[model samples]
Target: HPETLVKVKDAEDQLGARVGYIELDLNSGKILESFRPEERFPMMSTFKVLLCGAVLSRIDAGQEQLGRRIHYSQNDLVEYSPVTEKHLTDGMTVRELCSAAITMSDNTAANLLLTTIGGPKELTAFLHNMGDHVTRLDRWNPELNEAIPNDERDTTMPVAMATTLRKLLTGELLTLASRQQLIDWMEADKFAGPLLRSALPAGWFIADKSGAGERGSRGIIAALGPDGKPSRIVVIYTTGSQATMDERNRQIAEIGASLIKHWAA
Candidate 1:
């Protein structure tokens, strides 16, 4: 809709960056609204969703077990992660690591998953196998310490991400149990204040992942309305915004709220 695009464009004007967005009706598989949905942008921690998918695929193949654990030393530590704060020399189980990666966005936890999955090459292979050619994971965490160009960071096209997410939500990419576990981890996410979780109405259930960095912030929400009906999928990716997170978040929330209003019909 032009009206939806106007809202997104206004957000871009105020935030001082382009905003790529998409809202899809899960029931009908129709794109209810979009702007630059094919544009490529950094995914940051949103790559965790793909990582989780890769691992879950292995689990479905009986190649890995959720109960399996990894031992860590001080060399594995990441300064900002709450999981690191626990100081567990005994390490964590695969399930715990997945939870940390998705719900807490812990860098150390993500690195552990990447390392376990045999690094970025395996991740790239998995995405290609899933027919997602546009999203790629090129590196592990301590991303802030790396002097890489913004263009070289992990990236995904808006439609590509939405497409992959739809597969996960619909059980096309993983076993039903594995799919539900990933969604459970996302619903338990604790750091979603600046994205779709903030915009959704009360009683709605959302399974999503979010990403943020110097380039900007990205998020996707798979929502079920109050009556337990599949509502819509919202993907918002913004970059080069000099605006404060609060301002940017408000703008994002407004866009999401607008989608809920219109897509309700």
Candidate 2:
């Protein structure tokens, strides 16, 4: 048969969207399952996860500290920034900024962290330094999630997303404190169901980040495994569909379901 352990064609047929995903071993960097693994898809809020990773990278290298407080004015606030919007005048520590950005998918908080890491171009360069050339963040949030066809402005391949995620979360990309802080933030993520989290079986555990944007663009980057261990990196993204958000999330769930079957067998 094919090289992958799971097939996404049936799930792809169910939704009028392009589905790209990868399931890789956390420790070995082995591709255990994948579909459209190299295809470009809008990163959406999924990039926020990596955004925080880059922030932590700087901390690990002693270039920055997590407790640094950042202040911004009303003009800097963007939509969907519940946490940051609440603390605009008082400002936020870098850790709280990242927490709001990753856990709540706060747009302004993400941009603040983006600013801390020197914006989208700098984060892309951070990925490049990590040996990932396929992922790029060319614009700021909101604009980066535009998800236009034939657009490479802000997109990432499934393999690159999962690979970099694995390195950042499991490899030596961050020191113990920095890595744990990021992982703890991911574990505290506020949204999940109707996406990758919805399809996970009862015994499985997941710490994940899900994303949604224009043109039915949706995606997730997660660390999951059976029982209590989170040992696998799974990245899923969809774009170019005229489908509703519910439908897009359903497609991703089904694709995840198929993988569970493979793992069980």
Candidate 3:
């Protein structure tokens, strides 16, 4: 509907940010609505979901183990590593690292898991091998959040990220256990609210990860829908804004509201 575009465009303009989003119906693998959907936006912590999926694949292949322990010292710590920072002395299992990285957005856990899978380049290879050439990982955390305008590194299309997420979580990409684990970790993520979920209707659900960084870029990837309905894959991202993060979240929230109205109307 042309009016749908009007509503989403208004939400895009809500905070002076350029918004990009894609909503997919998993049953038909079809798009429900999209705007600037092919444009690249920084992946930031959103890539960690894929990162752990790659690890899970390795575990499925018997090359990695979920309970395998990784010990790291203070030198390995990075910004915003609340989970791993506290576990420096105790170390953590492979499962714990993935949980912290996905659920808590622990930067060190991501970096460590990134290394476990042979670093950023390997993770990109993992995506490419999965036929997800639309997604790429060119750097580690902190640096990845740079969100340099037009810089393709560490960026992904909203459509590709949503598709990749669906493929990993619902497709035969990994064993059922690993897929279940990955989706569950996303379900437990700490940062859902005041962004997409804040504007969601009652009893709607979203298993998601959100990211924010330089130039006011922000993003989310989710398996979302009404409580009794099948979940849809949704990806929302913004860039080139000078607004505050809270304002950015507000803008994204408004877009979420627009989508809900479009779905019900």
Candidate 4:
């Protein structure tokens, strides 16, 4: 049996949901195991990683700067945004926008950055160049995203997300400095739920981004063991979960702990 299958099955049984997962060796770039890894799920904030990559690509190309200003008005506001609460009136810099988008999953900041970078099409173009043809960015408007069916929202496969994450961290997509900067933002993410954050053993560092919608919550963690060596890359994308957010998060935490026990040595 695949190493991850038992733990994954237990998680699904408890949550009463379907989960798509992938485990990878960050060092060897080997897929350790997967469950429905090719199935596409709503990426939610995970897609922001691609948008961050899109903006970083331009910055690396001398076409944009982290310090560049991106103005936001009430018109740019989206529901459930910390960014709109603070920066809506005054606007923020590209760097700050990226920070909020990645760390806070701030909808206003994401939409502003999306518009600044030429909308969803630019993200699609960037991913295409990376050979990730399955991921799609359909709408930046929060209302539009909410209006669409859950499965129809911006979507990506677990394998595709993990592959792009590996490329982003391994320098196939960004410069070393740029990749480090992205890693810093991911590490600084304040919204990491109990799932990945609570599952790991003490002192293991994780750089990750998370997303939640009406039907599902998802996250990808790039973990380094206490020794600072690449440990494993884990992606958990869940839907059809019957549990509340808190309950579902606990299950994810259990899955993460199991992954560490089996793979983190």
Candidate 5:
């Protein structure tokens, strides 16, 4: 564990040049070590995990059914072109929505599920209970906050997020059945290809979520170390003022893979 900590810090100092952060450990609640684990950065698509938890919690509570289907409105269609409201043409199942939201990081799916799960306020409340402080989940309304304009809106941080992720990964955050569903949804997420996955040892299972955007983006690559030990390493790397997405992804990808490989070894 200490070796993992050493690598994490070293990565942070070198790879963390532009607003990066990380938190790593054995997944069993005993944290081996961390680097800038407390620093706050845009949570990016990482917040989708919280959105997934909020929805899944309701399902486990008997308030909702996994098979129920939902349709999206015009509001949900505004942001992402990759996922269209047309996909909701037949009213997709709750399970499908959850899968699309996490696996694909589908904005439309996220918005539809967000509305279905009770909006940002309720979701934020649920996350707050899980110790996710400094997290914000709301719509992009240009007139709302000056610090964050309407075109761009989201949440940020590491500590609270890392804890919540731990709850889900260990099957303690939700009912046994739902935790299985969560893991499946995450593993099925289409975003974990190449970068994060390449860093893991062959045959190792890596279930994680990634995020990116125009100004900047980030990820939380979660998995077990090659030593066959449970590991919970959260990497929040961003190119806030970087030149391009390609540039951002390359830098984060190379460093991120390096950090994961080094820590696991």
Candidate 6:
């Protein structure tokens, strides 16, 4: 079965990826397993977790309404052009931004949502409030530069992502309504290259987020387990001196799928 330690050692050796993990039994708060789970690594667009939270917190408090409209100006629509390149300067809802940020990890959608939702400061505050102190957000106005490294970007231990996911899923971090909204947003993700999606069992409901950057890829996975129970979150990252994108992704997925299959049994 996918008990914590077995998956940990297996991933470290077989996947050729830096490994970190944590397992929490929600009812007991008992840590089932932990492995190098505190050290931080670049999280890439997984940072959207915080961005998504920042947007949702406001909506939950009624400080910001989800129905508020935003139409991407012609200039802003450049990123998705050719495929969806038409100017969209009409009316779209805040809920749409939340969906776009995760579903496509759309850079333009993310920046627009970030601006409308109050930027990195608010994003940081929301993550911190959830007892996750190690994670961080950086200021990057992508319009200015191709690559912006403000405040060293962001880093997160796999454990942090796993823990926060557990909290978010079981309705411990936010209200049930709020948490459900986030899960729904995650479920809408359309990109399929991330490790978690490519590896997990078929026909299960999964809500996850993934991040990929110059030299690394990372993500967290949450799913309804076999037997009607939910699997503990699985968080993973792969990086090193140099690993081809296909090689790294395949290895990560191999290990991630192994873990889920192990636990579900």
Among these predicted structures, which one has the highest lDDT? Answer: 3
Q: Compose the digit string of candidate 3's lDDT tens values, residues 27-142.
A: 66788878988988998889999999999999999999999999999999989998998987789999999999988889899999999988999999999999999899999987
**RMSD in Å for candidate 3, one decimal?**
1.9
lDDT of 2 by residue, 1-265 (tens): 2222334665566666678878888889899778889989999999998899999988888888889988899999888998988986799999899889888899999998888877899999999998999999999978899988869988999998998888888778888887788888988888777777777788877889999888888899999889977878889888888877777777777777776666654
Residue 238 lDDT, candidate 5, scale 0-100: 49
- Once fitted onto the true fold, the runs of candidate 1 whose alpha carbons sit more than 4 angstroms away are 1-3, 144-152
lDDT of 2 at 11: 51
lDDT of each: 0.76, 0.84, 0.85, 0.77, 0.61, 0.63
lDDT for model 5 comes to 0.61
Predictions: Cα RMSD each: 2.4, 2.3, 1.9, 2.4, 4.2, 3.8
Off by over 4 Å in 3: 1-4, 228-230
Q: Which residue pairs of candidate 5 clash?
A: 103-189, 103-190
Q: Give the best candidate by TM-score.
A: 3
Per-residue C-alpha lDDT of model 5 across residues 1-265, encoded as one tens digit per residue: 2244454445444444344455656445654445556655556666777787888888888888889977666655645435546574676788887787688777777767777766777777887787765667765322112223223235555655666777766756689888878767776767766556655667565567877654444456464455544456565544344345554455555655656656534
Give the count of colliding residue pairs in each prediction: 0, 0, 0, 0, 2, 4
The digit string of per-residue lDDT tens for model 1 on 1-265 reads 3356788999999888878888777666678778999887777788887898899999999999899988888878775578854747678988999898888888888888988889987998999998888888888785732323347457777788887787776647898899889888987888776666666677777777777776445445454455544556667888777788778788877786666666546
lDDT of 6: 0.63
Candidate 4 CA-lDDT value: 0.77
Give lDDT tens digits, candidate 4, residues 178-219. 888888888788888676777666667788888776554544
Model 2 residue 60 lDDT?
A: 84
Query: How many clashes in candidate 6?
Result: 4
TM-score (all chains, Cα) for each model = 0.91, 0.94, 0.94, 0.91, 0.81, 0.81
Once fitted onto the true fold, the runs of candidate 4 whose alpha carbons sit more than 4 angstroms away are 1-3, 141-153
Q: Candidate 6 — which residues are off by over 4 angstroms?
A: 1-17, 26-29, 77-87, 141-152, 221-224, 227-229
The C-alpha stretches of model 2 lying farther than 4 A from their native spots are 1-7
Ranking by lDDT: 3, 2, 4, 1, 6, 5
